[PDB]
Amino acid sequence: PIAGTPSQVISDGKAIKKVALLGEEYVGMRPTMHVRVGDEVKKAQILFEDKKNPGVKFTSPVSGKVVEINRGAKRVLQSVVIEVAGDDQVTFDKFEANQLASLNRDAIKTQLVESGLWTAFRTRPFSKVPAIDSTSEAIFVTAMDTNPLAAEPTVVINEQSEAFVAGLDVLSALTTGKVYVCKKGTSLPRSQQPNVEEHVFDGPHPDHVAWSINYQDVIAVGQLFLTGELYTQRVVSLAGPVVNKPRLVRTVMGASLEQLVDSEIMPGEVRIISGSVLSGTKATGPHAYLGRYHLQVSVLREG
Numbered sequence: 001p002i003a004g005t006p007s008q009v010i011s012d013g014k015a016i017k018k019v020a021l022l023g024e025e026y027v028g029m030r031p032t033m034h035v036r037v038g039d040e041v042k043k044a045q046i047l048f049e050d051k052k053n054p055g056v057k058f059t060s061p062v063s064g065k066v067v068e069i070n071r072g073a074k075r076v077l078q079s080v081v082i083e084v085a086g087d088d089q090v091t092f093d094k095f096e097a098n099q100l101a102s103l104n105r106d107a108i109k110t111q112l113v114e115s116g117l118w119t120a121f122r123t124r125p126f127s128k129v130p131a132i133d134s135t136s137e138a139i140f141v142t143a144m145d146t147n148p149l150a151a152e153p154t155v156v157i158n159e160q161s162e163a164f165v166a167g168l169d170v171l172s173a174l175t176t177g178k179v180y181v182c183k184k185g186t187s188l189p190r191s192q193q194p195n196v197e198e199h200v201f202d203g204p205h206p207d208h209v210a211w212s213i214n215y216q217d218v219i220a221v222g223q224l225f226l227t228g229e230l231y232t233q234r235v236v237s238l239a240g241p242v243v244n245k246p247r248l249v250r251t252v253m254g255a256s257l258e259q260l261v262d263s264e265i266m267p268g269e270v271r272i273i274s275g276s277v278l279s280g281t282k283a284t285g286p287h288a289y290l291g292r293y294h295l296q297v298s299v300l301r302e303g
Contacts, residue, residue: 003241004149004239004240004241004242004243004246005149005239005246006149006151006237006238006239006246006247006248007245007246007247007248008151008152008155008248009155009247009248010155010156010159010235010247010248010249010250011247011248011249011250012249012250013236013238013249013250013251013255013260014249014259014260014261014262014264015259016084016251016252016255016256016259016260017083017084017256017259018064018067018081018082018083018084018256018259019061019062019064019081019082019084019252019253019254019255019256019289019290020068020079020080020081020082020254020256020286020289021047021048021058021060021061021079021080021254021289021292022078022079022254022281022287022289022291022292023048023076023077023078023079023080024072024076024077024078025281025291025292025293026050026058026119026128026129026292027126027127027128027129028050028052028053028128029050029052029053029077030050030051030052031048031049031050031051031058031077032048032049032050032051033047033048033069033077033080034046034047034048034049035047035048035066035069035080036066036069037066037067037068037069038065038066039065039066040064040065040066040085040088041060041063041064041065041066041082042060042063042088042089042090043059043060043061043062043063043087043088043089043090043229043230043232044059044060044089044090044091044092044114044115044116044229044230045059045060045090046058046059046060046116047059047060047066047080047082048077048080050129053128053129053131053132054132055113055132055133056113056118056119056129056132057113057114057116057118058116058119059090059115059116059230060082060116061082061230061232061252061253061254062082062084062232062252062254063084063085063086063087063088063089064082064083064084064085064086065082065083065085066080066081066082066083067081067082067083068080068081068286069081070285070286072286078286078287079286079287079289081286081289082254089229089230090114090115090230091228091229092111092114092115092224092228092229092230093107093111093225093228094225094226094227094228095225095226097162097165097166097169097226100166100169100170100173100222100225100226101169101170101172101173101192101193102173103170103173103225104173105135105173105174105176108170108173108174108225109132109174111224111225112174112221112224113132115224115230116230117217117220117221117224117230118130118132119292120213120214120217120220120221120292121139121211121212121213122211122212122213122293123136123209123210123211123212124140124209124210124211124212126209130209130211134207134209135174135175135176136175136176136177136209136210136211137175137176137177137178137208137210138175138177138178138180138210138211139171139174139175139178139179139180139210139211139212139213140179140180140182140210140211140212140213141168141171141179141180141181141182141212141213141214141215141218142182142212142213142214142215143157143181143182143183143188143214143215143218144182144183144184144201145295145296146203146204147275147276147278147279147296148276148277148278149237149239149240149246149276149296149298150237150276150295150296151235151236151237151248151295151296153183153215154184154186154188155235155248156215156216156219156235156248157188157189157215157219159235160219160222160223161189162222162226163219163220163222163223163226163231164188164189164215164218164219164222165189165190165191165192165222166221166222166223166225166226167217167218167219167220167221167222167223167225168181168191168193168196168218168222169191169192169193169196169222170221170222170225171196171213171218171221172191172193172195172196175195177195178195178196178197179191179193179195179196179197180197180198180199181196181197181198181199182199182201183198183199183200183201184200184201184202185200185202214293214295216234216235216295219231220232220233232252232253233250233252234250234251234252234253234255234290234295235248235249235250235251235295236248236249236251236260236290236294236295236296236297237295237296237297238260238261238264238296238297238299239296239297239298239299240298240299240300241299241300241301242265242266242268242270242299242300242301243261243264243265243266243299244264244265244266245264251290253290253292254289254290254292255289255290256288256289257272257274257283257288257289257290257297258272258288260290260297261297261299264299265299268301268302269301269302270299270300270301270302271284271299271300271301271302272284272288272297272298272299273297273298273299273300274287274288274289274290274291274294274297275291275293275294275296275297275298276296276298277298277300280294280298281294283297
């Protein structure tokens, strides 16, 4: 019973020379561009802002040069594409791990907003990035994944136990109430803060607004406050019936998916999806990049 089931083992992904942010992934987003084609950007430099969500910043995952600003019907921002070059970056304050749970909420927000990592959060429902002036009594951490062919979160978190817990400690200070780690039964490194809860699930077989953030973005939150640098590493499941060796591969936020799957694939006509067949983007043309909230890439036969 495989049908493209990934080996839950991490290895290096194929080389990535360009990345993008995808404008249509952010509910209600109406962009104001802060770069144009030809601009050089640092990692964590702002590429655009949302007119309908003032103060939220959408920042570059890499140092490089803006090579494409793709727009569709009614001029919607499809993608801002950055060709990797150099290692320039905006840096932020760093802290000892023992200080994180005691930081002030407003300083936490400012660092998350300024770095762009604030976009990791989405409200429930509406699925919008929270307003920067808002708070939540309930931050949910998704440390499980029910999508077919997803990466097992425990395997990823095991490489990054310190940063995962550090991220939970930051969230424990950010929430006005509790943090809820949604997980399968398998044990995980545990925050020591009393308002971080675990919610254990098993499956599948086969204002009062909560926020949600996935476990890889929690690792990124811990790295941001421990090191002062935006942490753009991703571990994604590369899987599907036409993937020769489905497995977990290291890549970067926003990675070119044409470059990521370069001869990982059996011959024939195939379709690349950022995310899963249940929740994904057809990764073609200006959309052929890893979506902000996607932790897997599915490649399937065409018919």
